[PDB]
Amino acid sequence: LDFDILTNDGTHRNMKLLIDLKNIFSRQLPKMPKEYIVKLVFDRHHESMVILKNKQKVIGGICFRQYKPQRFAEVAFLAVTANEQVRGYGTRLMNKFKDHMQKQNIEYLLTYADNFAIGYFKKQGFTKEHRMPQEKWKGYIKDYDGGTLMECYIHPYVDYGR
Amino acid sequence: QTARKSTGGKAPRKQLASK
Ligand SMILES: CC(C)(COP(=O)(O)OP(=O)(O)OC[C@H]1O[C@@H](n2cnc3c(N)ncnc32)[C@H](O)[C@@H]1OP(=O)(O)O)[C@@H](O)C(=O)NCCC(=O)NCCS
Numbered sequence: 469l470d471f472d473i474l475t476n477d478g479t480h481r482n483m484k485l486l487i488d489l490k491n492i493f494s495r496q497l498p499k500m501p502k503e504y505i506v507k508l509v510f511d512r513h514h515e516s517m518v519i520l521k522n523k524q525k526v527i528g529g530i531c532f533r534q535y536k537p538q539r540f541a542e543v544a545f546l547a548v549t550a551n552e553q554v555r556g557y558g559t560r561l562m563n564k565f566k567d568h569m570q571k572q573n574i575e576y577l578l579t580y581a582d583n584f585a586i587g588y589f590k591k592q593g594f595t596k597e598h599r600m601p602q603e604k605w606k607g608y609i610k611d612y613d614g615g616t617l618m619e620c621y622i623h624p625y626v627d628y629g630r
Numbered sequence: 631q632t633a634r635k636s637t638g639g640k641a642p643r644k645q646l647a648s649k
Contacts, residue, residue, distance in 0.1 A: 479648045498649030500641035508638045533637040544638025585642030615639060 470520040471564040474529075476510050488526040489518055496547035506522055508533075508544045509607065517565050519548065519557050530565050537609045540570055540600065541557040542609050543579040563591045566620070566628040575622055576600045580615040594618035 474482050474489070490509045494502040508514050508529050519528040528548035534541040541564075548557045569577060578600075581589045586596070598619050609617070640648065 472644060497641035498647070499643050513635060514638070530636065543640075543641035545640055580639035581642060585646040588642075592647055598645070601633060607631065609634070610636055611632060612639065 469561075470523060471517055472520055473568065474518050476518045476590065477479065485518055485520070485526050486516060487532070489516055489529045492528060492549045493545040493547050494525065495544060496550070497545060501546070514544060517561065517568060519552075519561050519573075521552075523616060528557055528561055530561055532565070534569075534572060534576075536574075537607055538604065539574055540578055540605060540608075541572075541574045541577040543577060546579075558588075559592065560629070563629040566622055568629065569622050570624060570626075577620040577622060578605060578609055579618055580612060581618050582615045586616050586618065589618045589620075592620065594620040 469552050474485055476486065484524060484566065486509055490505050493505045493509065497505070509516060511533070514531050514533045516531045518526045521527045530546040531544040532541045533544060546561070548561070566577070577594070578616060581588060596616055599621055600619055
């Protein structure tokens, strides 16, 4: 059980794992156009942290993009494959992700969530009440009136995992 | 906005699933 950061570096190994992650994202988010998932996962501004089983099988992951000078990151997609859900991997992934964001000097995580995900993100400590001013994300994150933007503050000295 | 490169927003309908 490894949680490795994967980026489009053009090797066959990382590419196969990024396609496997894209395939988990489309099968677990069927409302999402599959061509839109491909475009963000393989965009040079996005990175993906995968949950690697036996150092070769991707069973989950989180695709995100950092706004390094602004110190915030928006979570693109997050999913765990169906046959590996309710095994606590999703929480271990979010904790490993927040630990990496703390090391990347990222202060806030933002994500658009609607319906059930408002609840899953509230359990991972994301709130609908923002602490970060609206003008800090405007012009970097898209303002949709159709979703609920949730934010999680990453304090520099909180330990993330249990 | 009117990005066409930006970050990403999910597609969580509601977890009892089919689309
Ligand atoms: C959201 C997701 C990543 C969570 O991953 P996971 O491996 O199942 O997560 P965990 O096992 O850590 O979840 C533990 C908790 O979630 C609940 N849970 C997990 N999967 C569930 C499901 N399918 N239905 C109902 N409850 C569920 C458990 O009851 C458990 O109880 P707790 O919240 O009191 O601790 C996973 O359900 C998934 O891939 N969903 C589809 C993709 C999606 O909607 N992603 C978010 C938007 S992109």
